[PDB]
Write a protein that binds this ligand. Structure first.
Ligand SMILES: *[C@@H]1O[C@H](CO)[C@@H](O[C@@H]2O[C@H](CO)[C@@H](O[C@@H]3O[C@H](CO)[C@@H](O)[C@H](O)[C@@H]3O)[C@H](O)[C@H]2NC(C)=O)[C@H](O)[C@H]1NC(C)=O
Ligand SMILES: *[C@@H]1O[C@H](CO)[C@@H](O[C@@H]2O[C@H](CO)[C@@H](O[C@@H]3O[C@H](CO)[C@@H](O)[C@H](O)[C@@H]3O)[C@H](O)[C@H]2NC(C)=O)[C@H](O)[C@H]1NC(C)=O
Ligand SMILES: *[C@@H]1O[C@H](CO)[C@@H](O[C@@H]2O[C@H](CO)[C@@H](O)[C@H](O)[C@H]2NC(C)=O)[C@H](O)[C@H]1NC(C)=O
Ligand SMILES: *[C@@H]1O[C@H](CO)[C@@H](O[C@@H]2O[C@H](CO)[C@@H](O)[C@H](O)[C@H]2NC(C)=O)[C@H](O)[C@H]1NC(C)=O
Ligand SMILES: *[C@@H]1O[C@H](CO)[C@@H](O[C@@H]2O[C@H](CO)[C@@H](O)[C@H](O)[C@H]2NC(C)=O)[C@H](O)[C@H]1NC(C)=O
Ligand SMILES: *[C@@H]1O[C@H](CO)[C@@H](O)[C@H](O)[C@H]1NC(C)=O
Ligand SMILES: *[C@@H]1O[C@H](CO)[C@@H](O)[C@H](O)[C@H]1NC(C)=O
Ligand SMILES: *[C@@H]1O[C@H](CO)[C@@H](O)[C@H](O)[C@H]1NC(C)=O
Ligand SMILES: *[C@@H]1O[C@H](CO)[C@@H](O)[C@H](O)[C@H]1NC(C)=O
Lengths: 66, 74, 66
């Protein structure tokens, strides 16, 4: 099985978008998460892009694990 | 069991100018079921009622509050 | 990653008399980087900005305010 497909699929959104849906994008979900962690009061587009680059570099480094 | 999809907002302010009178919901959430006005509900159940004194809290303007241009009457 | 050491305080009051106008920080912390004035930062990151309406909360005098 794949984790996020199939008959018994897991939710990709449930722990950062929550159980009451309506947040439209991942940038708006991550800005609210940075606000609740107390590191930015109101996240701008450079604050969220800096988090998106650091996510994508780490996720691409999984393919080089020895 | 059954859900409903409403509009919601962190707070309500009268005008666009900084220094306006603003309110947030007291122990609940500001909801609107595609109406022309705003109401109060518990945070985990939709059970709407009109906005009152001892239902809201007067605060200062936060980020991304909804502007009424109306001067709400409580 | 990198830290800074600032001054901090639970709240700020105008005068010594009981019944003075006092403020505490709203969703943040009162910081001062060895300055002559006080600023606002998020609680988990040093990102200072000057004190404003809709940045503080008017309270009564607590214990050990500056
Ligand atoms: C909760 O609040 C809403 C929003 O104010 C209430 O609905 C509104 O009620 C007023 C007053 O009944 C209506 O305004 C005017 O009514 C007069 C009656 O003399 C009439 O002459 C006017 O033509 C006008 O309709 C208003 O239409 C109505 N709706 C809206 C969208 O504002 C509602 O009644 C409240 N619910 C409660 C207190 O349970
Ligand atoms: C954040 O707040 C601080 C504290 O007030 C600001 O620094 C202060 O800015 C004022 C005004 O620019 C300075 O006061 C006076 O400036 C006039 C200009 O006409 C001059 O004639 C006087 O000699 C006097 O300097 C003040 O020196 C300055 N520093 C301090 C320690 O009070 C700061 O600019 C603010 N930052 C912002 C708004 O980004
Ligand atoms: C993240 O996804 C984006 C998809 O838009 C990737 O960007 C493209 O990647 C391909 C593959 O090398 C390039 O050929 C394109 O030129 C890229 N386009 C843009 C607009 O960037 C990006 O490489 C991905 N990042 C990581 C770290 O995997
Ligand atoms: C209030 O407005 C919203 C948006 O117009 C309604 O939600 C839509 O409902 C339809 C049918 O259920 C869906 O196909 C749309 O995708 C929904 N939109 C969104 C953005 O989710 C809602 O049903 C409206 N009516 C009420 C609350 O009575
Ligand atoms: C602001 O003042 C404090 C205290 O004077 C400074 O912290 C000192 O830093 C030196 C060198 O880093 C240490 O040897 C001292 O032990 C520190 N003192 C304390 C009480 O921890 C701080 O560096 C000052 N400067 C700023 C914030 O720019
Ligand atoms: C739960 O919702 C269903 C509608 O699908 C309804 O038939 C049922 O009666 C509801 N449960 C209760 C306890 O009313
Ligand atoms: C929230 O406010 C900012 C300005 O502070 C604005 O750029 C942004 O578009 C607002 N959010 C929405 C969903 O309109
Ligand atoms: C973390 O701090 C070090 C300084 O020791 C710096 O060289 C490095 O660039 C910092 N990390 C990032 C992502 O900037
Ligand atoms: C805090 O206030 C008490 C008096 O209520 C005083 O004795 C104490 O020294 C103060 N703390 C500091 C660090 O000065």
């Amino acid at each position: 099985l794949g984790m996020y497909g199939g008959i018994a699929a897991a939710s990709l959104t449930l722990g950062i978008f929550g159980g009451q849906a309506g947040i439209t994008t991942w940038s708006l979900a991550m800005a609210g998460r940075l606000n609740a962690l107390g590191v930015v009061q109101n996240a701008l587009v450079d604050d969220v892009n800096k988090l998106a680059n650091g996510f994508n570099q780490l996720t691409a480094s999984v393919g080089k694990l020895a | 069991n059954n859900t409903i999809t409403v509009k919601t907002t962190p707070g309500l302010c009268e005008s666009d100018e900084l220094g306006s009178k603003c309110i947030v919901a007291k122990d609940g959430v500001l909801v609107s079921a595609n109406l022309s006005y705003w109401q109060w509900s518990p945070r985990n159940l939709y059970k709407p009622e009109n906005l009152t004194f001892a239902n809201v809290i007067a605060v200062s303007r936060g980020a991304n509050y909804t502007t009424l241009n109306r001067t709400f009457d409580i």
